[PDB]
Amino acid sequence: AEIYPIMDKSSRTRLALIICNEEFDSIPRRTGAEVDITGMTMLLQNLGYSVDVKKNLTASDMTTELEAFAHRPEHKTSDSTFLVFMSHGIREGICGKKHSEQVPDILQLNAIFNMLNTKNCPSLKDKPKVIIIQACRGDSPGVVWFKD
């Protein structure tokens, strides 16, 4: 009993969401996101997930689409989910399509976790939420030089 349940292929109706932010109104474009979308969708379709591609969503639109995804009636006949997020990002979290220095519009990772728990998404009880994120979280190149 160390493996999550997997039901019949012919009756399971999973749902995986893929959000990407390619075009922006105050930020340079995220070139190459098209190949990312195509590859992610093809791999998930190979896995067996009814993907849902969304592009250029504000954080408010992010939230309402997440709630709609949680409320979809296909979750009751599933056993998992995928939420592949790919956009710009800062220390706080994911960047929306309307991000700017003057006014920030950030969808935090904490909010994503909160809007998929058992209270807000009762249809996903005892079911993994395998979230995938592709966004920066800071400025440092991630490497340091030390005298050995």
Binding site: A1, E2, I3, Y4, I6, K9, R30, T31, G32, A33, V35, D36, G39, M40, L43, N46, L47, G48, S80, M86, G89, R91, L109, F113, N114, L116, N117, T118, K119, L124, K125, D126, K127, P128, K129, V130, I131, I132, I133, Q134, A135, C136, R137, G138, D139, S140, P141, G142, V143
Partner: protein
């Protein structure tokens, strides 16, 4: 009719980089993190769970190659090994 269910019981985040770093993206080949992720799901998803697949992706970024980055497995709250079992 009413249970407890452990609000926020099953979750596995997988960020592209550790906190306070930068993640790269090839302009035409696609995102390097996403590219490695999809390669590892194409090759290993039938023999390694999500946790160990993410570990393989993380190890594949170990030795820096100039544009270096380090995937992070945030808030791993999984209780059981999760095999996707694609097409089975």
């Amino acid at each position: 009719a009413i249970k407890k269910a452990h609000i926020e019981k099953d979750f596995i985040a997988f960020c592209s980089s550790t906190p306070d770093n930068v993640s790269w993206r090839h302009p035409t080949m696609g995102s390097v993190f996403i590219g490695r992720l999809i390669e590892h799901m194409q090759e290993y998803a039938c023999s390694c769970d999500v946790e160990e697949i993410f570990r393989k992706v993380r190890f594949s970024f170990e030795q820096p190659d100039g544009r270096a980055q380090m995937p992070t497995t945030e808030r791993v709250t999984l209780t059981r090994c999760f095999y996707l079992f694609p097409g089975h």
